[PDB]
């Protein structure tokens, strides 16, 4: 016989079959945050369905906004204006900094290193000030929309993003001073959760979960979206497939996100921020209150919403947790017929059982840390 531990209720239920110190079986029971998001999406318009995507990976809000917006814009056969695309890449990499701070610092907090959590969440508070200045909300911005973004950058925001970005690499340096060469942090991560490249491909892993195993794959490079082919950055590649190389990949992705943010601040073009098709994006309020066509289009976009032509797309981005996909099916109406949400954490938490075999019970919280799991996107 062997021990069965029911680690009850982010929130997760775990059914462990242990054989002493070792883990024989790990059965993650989920659905504790299943909210039926993508059934609720079927009864709402495309604009009304957008704020559900803020709340899936709720540390990667504008990235999921971007993925849903790219899906709807692909089905609408329209493209965002260039300044909107540069704002989306800028705030997508700010979002990537947010998520990797959350990932690395809570993964260190669950192992026992509680202090760089507090050090990096002040930087995270400043990036939430950036979200609040651009949209009015600290987390669920509802800002990146199909057609572009909702509102242009306020004056003086890019200077403050520059003042943040100029100092953030020292914050990464002192995080990396606390953890990377620390022998206690290395003993908790170096031989832990080793995934081969073939098993990572076969188990549907994506993002750092592939790149820690040496797979040279990044969707911003291979299948590029808005203006990621115009920014220059490197892709950190692991060598041993463990928790420690995935940690180093996330730290170096924060480095490369700072690099992309500097390039976005220097290459921000002038122009409009919504697509100038007023049958898709709402007109400005000054012309809504002056022009008859603009008032009609405002009325119909905020009550019926735009009709999307019939068809199905699978649109994926390189979200900070991995490949975030939307399989969006439109029937021709102004509401989605079907919206399957592909989250990286779903397949990663499915691979948790293989990743935890032969390890200890204290290694399982490290493996649940290195798979960056937010249960909003896992459960929908």
């Amino acid at each position: 016989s062997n021990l069965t531990l029911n680690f009850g209720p982010g929130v997760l239920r775990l059914v462990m079959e242990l054989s002493g110190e070792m883990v024989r079986k790990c059965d993650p029971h989920i659905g504790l945050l299943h909210r039926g998001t993508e059934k609720l999406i079927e009864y709402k318009t495309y604009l009304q369905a957008l704020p559900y995507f803020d709340r899936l990976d709720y540390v990667s809000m504008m990235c999921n906004e971007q993925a849903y917006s790219l899906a709807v814009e692909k089905l609408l056969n329209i493209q965002p204006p260039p300044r909107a695309q540069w704002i989306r890449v800028l705030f997508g990499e700010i979002t990537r900094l947010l998520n990797h701070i959350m990932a690395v610092t809570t993964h260190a907090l669950d192992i026992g290193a509680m202090t760089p959590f507090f050090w990096m969440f002040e930087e995270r508070e400043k990036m939430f000030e950036f979200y609040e200045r651009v949209s009015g909300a600290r987390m669920h911005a509802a800002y990146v929309r199909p057609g572009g973004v909702h509102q242009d950058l306020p004056l003086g925001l890019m200077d403050d993003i520059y003042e943040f970005s100029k100092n953030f690499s020292l914050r990464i340096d002192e995080l990396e001073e606390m953890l990377t060469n620390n022998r206690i942090w290395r003993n908790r991560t170096v031989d832990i959760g080793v995934v081969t490249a073939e098993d990572a491909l076969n188990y549907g892993f994506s993002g750092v979960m592939l790149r820690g195993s040496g797979i040279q794959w990044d969707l911003r490079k291979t299948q590029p979206y808005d203006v990621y082919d115009q920014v220059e950055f490197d892709v950190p590649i692991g060598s041993r497939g463990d928790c420690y190389d995935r940690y180093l990949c996330r730290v170096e992705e924060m480095r490369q996100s700072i690099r992309i943010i500097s390039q976005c601040l220097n290459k921000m073009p002038p122009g409009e921020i919504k697509v100038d098709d007023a049958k898709v994006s709402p007109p400005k309020r000054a012309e809504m209150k002056t022009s008859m066509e603009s008032l009609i289009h405002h009325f119909k976009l905020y009550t019926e919403g735009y009709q999307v032509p019939p068809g199905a797309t699978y649109t994926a981005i390189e979200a900070p947790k991995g490949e975030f996909g939307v399989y969006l099916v439109s029937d021709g109406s102004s509401r989605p017929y079907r919206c399957k949400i592909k989250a990286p954490g779903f397949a990663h938490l499915a691979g948790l059982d293989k990743m935890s075999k032969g390890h200890m019970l204290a290694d399982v919280v490290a493996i649940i840390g290195t798979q960056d799991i937010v249960f909003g996107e896992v459960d929908r």
Partner: protein, 113 residues
């Protein structure tokens, strides 16, 4: 030059990649000769396997073979040859060159409804 690592976790370095690819490609062709000639899988897989086997027999260097086989490392080219061999052995049993087993219903792929 005896490459130290493939870079991929769990993918060991092959000592003799040329002889291993020759064995795998001739074994793919031997398995693939058990498929009827009118089957498109046999024609297409004989075509690409003969192309890869001629490239392997033409190039003594390992790195240049990797650049002109155009399939990444030579060890994942070996892994893909093994996958193609396993696939051909399964395609003999499935016999998927046969006609369509059943037509769909008349509005099964009509979208929108």
């Amino acid at each position: 030059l005896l490459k130290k690592t493939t870079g991929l976790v769990g993918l060991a370095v092959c000592e003799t990649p040329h002889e291993r690819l020759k064995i795998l490609y001739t074994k793919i062709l031997d398995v693939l000769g058990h498929i009827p000639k009118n089957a498109a899988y046999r024609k297409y897989t004989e075509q690409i396997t003969n192309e890869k086997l001629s490239i392997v027999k033409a190039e003594p260097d390992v790195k240049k073979l990797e650049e002109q086989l155009q399939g990444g490392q030579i060890e994942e080219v070996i892994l893909q040859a093994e996958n193609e061999l396993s696939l051909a052995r399964k395609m003999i049993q499935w016999k998927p060159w046969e006609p369509l087993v059943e037509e769909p219903p008349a509005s099964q792929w009509k979208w929108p409804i």
